[PDB]
Amino acid sequence: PQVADLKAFSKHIYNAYLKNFNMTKKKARSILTGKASHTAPFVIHDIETLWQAEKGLVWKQLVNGLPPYKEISVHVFYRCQCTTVETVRELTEFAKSIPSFSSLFLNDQVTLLKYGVHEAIFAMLASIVNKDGLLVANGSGFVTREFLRSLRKPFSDIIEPKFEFAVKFNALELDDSDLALFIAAIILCGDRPGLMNVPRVEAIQDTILRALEFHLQANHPDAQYLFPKLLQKMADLRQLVTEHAQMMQRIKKTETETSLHPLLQEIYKDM
Ligand SMILES: COc1cccc(-c2ccc(C(=O)N(Cc3ccccc3OCCCCCC(=O)O)C3CC3)cc2)c1
Ligand SMILES: CCCCCCCO[C@@H]1O[C@H](CO)[C@@H](O)[C@H](O)[C@H]1O
Ligand SMILES: CCCCCCCO[C@@H]1O[C@H](CO)[C@@H](O)[C@H](O)[C@H]1O
Ligand SMILES: CCCCCCCO[C@@H]1O[C@H](CO)[C@@H](O)[C@H](O)[C@H]1O
């Protein structure tokens, strides 16, 4: 009985995912591997190719809309911020497309997004990453990991840990239908500080995890220990976000000319 009900539940979460996210892992891997396309991403690996990309690639966020130019490393940070905020927007609409999330009081919705979106962002980020770099500008660009390493501290340091996480996460070979459930479980988390209706959120979280376990039995029948591996990745994401927030505090303290987006300020306020 419940195996069948949870299958339906999972399909509605997958549909929420397909409706709301700009890029799927399926599309991202087809770009990263070269698989079937008349166009290849422009590679950004140094200052000259960065300038050419700002001149010539199509950006969701127009360069003139970014804060005033300071230097190369900050400019990259500002592009990172733009994408982070765009993904918060997508995660919010994904969450709101899940009925049991929308049925929560709005203040609990905000609490879940506040403490869950970065975890979800760093999980979804793996979809566009390989060991050598990541996709940018809706897949029309590829920024090398080596170039990102060459940025000055603190900006290079806040980037590299996410690659380290992503390469290990991608070795589990999740597809979009697995990720939709994984991300929903990250957002619908009963552990978040200040939740008003903890039992309700705990119950939803449990349903999603049961759906995930069963989804993996069907979709990855040969993969041993995959469900417990993913619970551990959820734990790992919490630690990755703690470190990230600590690094952001140092950027706020020491990089005083760097602007932080007001929405992210609200997210870090009580972290
Ligand atoms: C010319 O254009 C470019 C040049 C060079 C790099 C880029 C670029 C590179 C990476 C992204 C990106 O997709 N992201 C950012 C990202 C990716 C990996 C590691 C870290 C990281 O952000 C850390 C800072 C986050 C601050 C916000 C905060 O939380 O307060 C995804 C997370 C969203 C977009 C754009 C564009
Ligand atoms: C203000 C300092 C920080 C500026 C750098 C980040 C700007 O990002 C963009 O800002 C818009 C304003 O909300 C969002 O709507 C977009 O989704 C987001 O991509
Ligand atoms: C359902 C609409 C009416 C909601 C009214 C309740 C608002 O509560 C506020 O929720 C915020 C998180 O969302 C917390 O950060 C605040 O501390 C808390 O005061
Ligand atoms: C778009 C969803 C992303 C959530 C954005 C981050 C939430 O910020 C919080 O908003 C609450 C008001 O609602 C305040 O009470 C809190 O002090 C503040 O930390």
Indicate the top mutation candidate among 72, 76, 80 to test ligand 1's pocket, ranked by most ligand atoms within 8 A of CB: 80
Q: Which ligand is nearest to the CA of 122?
A: 1
Query: Ligand 2: distance of its center to the CA of 137 in Å?
Result: 15
Give the N- to C-terminal CA distance of the chain in Å, as an integer.
41
C-alpha span between 50 and 38 (Å, rounded): 22
Query: Ligand 1: distance of its center to the CA of 77 in Å?
Result: 6
Pair of tokens at residue 255: 């990089």
Sheet holding 129-130, edge to edge: 42-44, 141-144, 133-136, 129-130
Which residue's CA is the closest to the ligand 1 atom numbered 14? Answer: 80
Which residue's CA is the closest to the ligand 2 atom numbered 7? Answer: 82
CATH entry 1.10.565.10 includes domain 1-271: yes
Burial-class residue 185 by CB neighbours within 10 Å (0-12, 13-18, 19+). buried
**Closest by CA position to 191, among listed 234, 224, 253, 244:** 234
C-alpha span between 132 and 167 (Å, rounded): 10
Indicate the top mutation candidate among 72, 82, 84 to test ligand 1's pocket, ranked by most ligand atoms within 8 A of CB: 84
CB 82 within 8 A of CB 61: yes
> Helix or strand or coil: residue 135?
strand
Pair of tokens at residue 235: 């734990």
Q: What is the CA radius of gyration of the chain?
A: 19
C-alpha span between 88 and 121 (Å, rounded): 8
Residues whose CB falls within 8 Å of the CB of residue 144, separated by 6 or more in sequence, listed in order: 43, 44, 45, 132, 133
- The pairing of beta strand 141-144 with beta strand 42-44: parallel
**Closest by CA position to 113, among listed 125, 98, 129:** 98
155-170 and 106-125 helices, crossing angle to 10°: 80
> Helix or strand or coil: residue 130?
strand
Q: Is 85 in the pocket of ligand 2 (CB under 6 A)?
A: yes
In angstroms, what is the resolution?
Answer: 1.7
Q: Residue 17: enclosing H or E segment and its boundaries?
A: helix 2-20
Helix-strand-coil percent breakdown of the chain, rounded to 5?
70, 5, 25
Residues whose CB falls within 8 Å of the CB of residue 15, separated by 6 or more in sequence, listed in order: 97
Q: Residue 101: enclosing H or E segment and its boundaries?
A: helix 99-102
Sign of the torsion angle spanned by Cα atoms 46, 51, 55, 60: positive
List the domain boundaries for the chain.
1-271
Which atom of ligand 2 lies closest to the CA of 81?
6
Identity of the amino acid at 54: E
Pair of tokens at residue 117: 């979106």
Say how many C-beta atoms besides its own lie within 10 A of residue 153's C-beta.
10
Pair of tokens at residue 258: 């760097």
> Helix or strand or coil: residue 43?
strand
C-alpha span between 133 and 175 (Å, rounded): 20
CA 74, 61, 57 angle in degrees (round to 5)?
90
Which experimental approach was used here?
A: X-ray
Counting other chains too, the contacts that 229-238 makes at CB distance below 8 Å and 24 or more residues apart are 229/172, 230/172, 230/182, 233/123, 233/169, 233/172, 234/119, 234/182, 234/185, 234/186, 236/165, 237/119, 237/122, 237/123, 237/165, 237/186, 238/119
C-alpha span between 229 and 248 (Å, rounded): 28
